[PDB]
Design a protein around this ligand. Structure first.
Ligand code: SF4
Ligand code: SF4
Ligand code: FCO
Ligand code: CL
Ligand code: FE2
Ligand code: NI
Lengths: 279, 481
């Protein structure tokens, strides 16, 4: 069927969510772009630019009012009247992230908050920050915007979590229609707004080093791959993600095998997971 | 007459950038670049366990996180007095080197190539300017599209190479103070080499030739974008444990002269930047980051770094010009066949053609070929099974600086530790050197100056403004942090 229109707006992000998506294996990113979604606005990869790109998004948004998917990456900084994140200019008027989310948010079918920054505030909201970095769901709620939000956290997320959540939504909408479908998606979210197919299992309880943890056999150097990584700082016990199984980058490694888990999918990342290299 | 053109967002770069240019008689006569998003990593970092920095700093930029990882762990190594085992030094080079390949391929195909190639008739490849100045034949345009598609797989493979010893990508887990967290095994070195062969073949057979071939249809693009013709390299990729030798050696080039690099000569100005006036003109060892988003006259969150007063550029052109390596065999051949140019070493292109819009794309392609030999050497040098890390105690009081070359140019991190926590952390990154605003004397940043003279014969289709910007491969996450 017709591929749904998607707009990708970045606030205070590092583009990691886009790069991680480019690493999708099955389906490939080429297949995602040509067969799964219609990516109508994405400043990192799109052909056009500037006010023309903004106006193209606005034209599509009007035609597909209530029907487009809005991907928000990065936190939304509210201090200084939104000035810490300007994403565009049209009609000689700057467009802050705050402005853009107030414009497009109410008219999206759903907002997909991709990455921990967008989902929960993340590093831009961490101790020492001063931009009023705000999570997407909080920002929308504070502004009376009732559009459904799905959180797909991680710093960055795995591509399979992003693509897979889009497919969850597509399957549900095919079966139930748009409103009924999104209701079925909301039913498989955990209390932090994360889809349970990807975030419903604990790293530690599924970890291949759990036996060593139970025995108290702890590695004292990173390069000791026999012992548990808990003394080196592993946050697996407090982390809900399926990295132990799908692993990263085509299955070639993952954080616990290589070093430690830093709990990047969790709402308290980074401060509640720090220091990273001690328990 | 004058026409002023604002472009926000500049697309097919990383991050948030506005460009505003003044056009008169068909050419750019003035320019201002505005980095529009700030996070403030330098203040977020304060108070933390210093070892956390090598994770936190990567989130400055998900395109070049291995560069920040590397600069951070080098700074921490110095501050902690960590002696990285030889095998860990080489393992780090394999992790970081693989992202140079990813980043250059990403940049040419997925960011830049649409400047010259028409993509298929669906978003995000349309709509675009009605007169996009796309000059390639049906056949050569199709090769561009086919290679863009192939390059999506190749850059993904490069990230698999990064992850083999780095854990995952974006945002490696595998570099820490004291070395690398995972000893390479025979089995995983076979996996790295197999992927590397595929990337090598793509670089040699497709990427380097396509840059010269497209360039030969855009010869006018070698005659504009010179700017200051001034470059910086701070050195990168330690080739031994003594630190006396690097794949890229440091140097400065300005006003037709080579000079040594002295980091004490770096100062960051803020008159035209959104930061407190009293923080202007500081060397990074005494750096301060105090945002002032309402300050009159300012137009960017990027500070303005100057080297002994000079506005310099960084990146593959800078490194290739400073180091002047031999050109690739295919580059030499296509320079002769397609341009009528006889060249052996990079400087044989001449200053004008090297420091140009298209010359920057050529430099990046040549550097990618150059990096193949470096990675091949590291694969021969590495020893399966040999330890890659030491586990040093956190100091109560210390300082350190890490210098390296990110794919887009020179990067340094400085850290000061007091009471076992980060007291100050300062970052001076590549796109900071390229995409900065005017300094306190009114001297333009490198890209601002390189925009001067860019042709705009059609103000309704001013395609060459962002083409010039994209030649520098900007990432504003890095620039502002
Ligand atoms: S603490 Fe849990 S068992 Fe050790 S998730 Fe981490 S290395 Fe595995
Ligand atoms: S959740 Fe890596 S740090 Fe985040 S990717 Fe920990 S294992 Fe999953
Ligand atoms: N490459 C890269 Fe990132 C930038 N600019 C750094 O340093
Ligand atoms: Cl990098
Ligand atoms: Fe800085
Ligand atoms: Ni970067």
């Amino acid at each position: 069927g017709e591929r749904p229109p998607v707009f990708w707006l970045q606030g205070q992000g590092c583009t990691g969510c886009s790069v991680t998506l480019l690493n999708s294996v099955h389906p490939s990113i080429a297949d995602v772009l040509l067969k799964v979604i219609s990516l109508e606005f994405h400043p990192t990869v799109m052909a056009w630019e500037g006010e023309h790109a903004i106006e193209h998004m606005r034209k599509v948004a009007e035609k597909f009012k209530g029907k487009f998917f809005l991907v928000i990456e990065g936190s939304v900084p509210v201090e200084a009247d939104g000035k810490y994140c300007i994403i565009g200019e049209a009609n000689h008027h700057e467009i802050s992230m705050v402005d853009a989310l107030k414009e497009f948010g109410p008219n999206a079918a759903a907002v997909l908050a991709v990455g921990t920054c967008a989902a929960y505030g993340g590093i831009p909201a961490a101790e020492g920050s001063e931009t009023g970095a705000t999570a997407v769901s909080k920002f929308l709620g504070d502004n009376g915007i009732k559009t459904p939000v799905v959180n797909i956290p991680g710093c960055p997320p795995h591509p399979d979590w992003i693509v897979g959540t889009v497919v969850l939504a597509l399957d549900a909408i095919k079966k139930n229609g748009l409103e009924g479908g999104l209701a079925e998606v909301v039913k498989v979210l955990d209390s932090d707004g994360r889809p349970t197919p990807f975030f419903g299992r604990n790293i530690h309880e599924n970890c291949p080093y759990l036996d060593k943890y139970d025995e108290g056999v702890m590695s004292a150097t990173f390069t000791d791959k026999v012992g548990c990584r808990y003394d080196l700082g592993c946050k697996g016990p407090m982390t809900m993600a399926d990295c132990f199984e799908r692993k990263w980058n085509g299955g070639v490694n993952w954080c616990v095998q290589n070093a430690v888990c830093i709990g990047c999918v969790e709402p308290d990342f980074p401060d509640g997971k720090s220091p990273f290299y001690q328990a | 007459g004058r026409t002023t053109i604002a472009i926000d967002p500049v697309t097919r770069i990383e991050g948030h950038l506005k460009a505003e240019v003044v056009v008169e008689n068909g050419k750019v006569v003035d320019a201002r670049l505005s980095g529009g998003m700030y996070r403030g990593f330098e203040t977020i970092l304060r108070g933390r366990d210093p070892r956390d920095a090598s994770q936190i700093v990567q989130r400055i930029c998900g395109v070049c996180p291995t560069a920040h990882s590397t600069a951070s762990v080098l700074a921490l190594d110095e501050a902690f007095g960590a002696k990285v085992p030889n095998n860990g030094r080489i393992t780090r080079n394999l992790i970081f080197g693989a992202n140079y390949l990813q980043s250059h391929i990403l940049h040419f195909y997925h960011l830049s190539a649409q400047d010259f190639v028409q993509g298929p008739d669906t978003a995000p490849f349309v709509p675009r300017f009605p007169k996009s100045d796309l000059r390639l034949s049906k056949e050569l345009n199709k090769a561009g599209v086919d290679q863009y598609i192939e390059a999506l797989e190749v850059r993904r493979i490069c990230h698999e190479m990064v992850a083999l010893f780095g854990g995952r990508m974006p945002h490696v887990q595998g570099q820490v103070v004291g070395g690398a967290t995972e000893i390479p095994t025979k089995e995983k070195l076979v996996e790295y080499a197999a992927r590397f062969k595929k990337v090598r073949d793509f670089v040699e057979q497709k990427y380097v030739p396509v840059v010269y071939t497209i360039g030969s249809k855009y010869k006018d693009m070698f005659k504009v974008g010179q700017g200051f013709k001034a470059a910086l390299c701070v050195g990168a990729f330690p080739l031994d444990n003594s630190g006396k030798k690097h794949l890229f050696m440091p140097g400065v080039y300005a006003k037709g002269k080579d000079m040594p690099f002295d980091p004490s000569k770096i100062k960051e100005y803020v008159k035209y930047s959104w930061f407190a006036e009293e923080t202007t003109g500081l060397n990074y060892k005494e750096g301060k980051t105090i945002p002032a988003p309402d300050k009159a006259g300012a137009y960017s969150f990027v500070k303005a770094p100057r080297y002994d007063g000079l506005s310099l550029e960084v990146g593959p052109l800078a490194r290739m010009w400073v180091n002047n390596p031999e050109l690739s065999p295919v580059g030499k051949k296509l320079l002769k066949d397609l341009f009528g140019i006889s060249a052996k070493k990079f400087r044989d292109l001449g200053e004008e053609a090297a420091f140009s819009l298209m010359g920057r794309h050529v430099a990046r392609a040549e550097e990618t070929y150059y990096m193949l030999g470096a990675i091949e050497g590291w694969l021969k040098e590495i020893k399966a099974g040999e330890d890659t890390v030491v586990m040093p105690a956190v100091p109560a009081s210390a300082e350190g600086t890490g210098f390296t070359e990110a794919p887009r140019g020179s990067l340094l991190h400085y850290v000061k530790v007091k009471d076992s926590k980060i007291d100050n952390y300062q970052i001076v990154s590549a796109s900071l050197w390229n995409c900065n605003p005017r300094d306190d004397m009114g001297q333009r940043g490198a890209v601002e100056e390189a925009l001067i003279g860019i042709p705009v014969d059609d103000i309704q289709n001013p395609v060459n403004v962002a083409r010039l910007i994209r030649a520098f491969d900007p990432x504003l996450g890095c620039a502002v942090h």
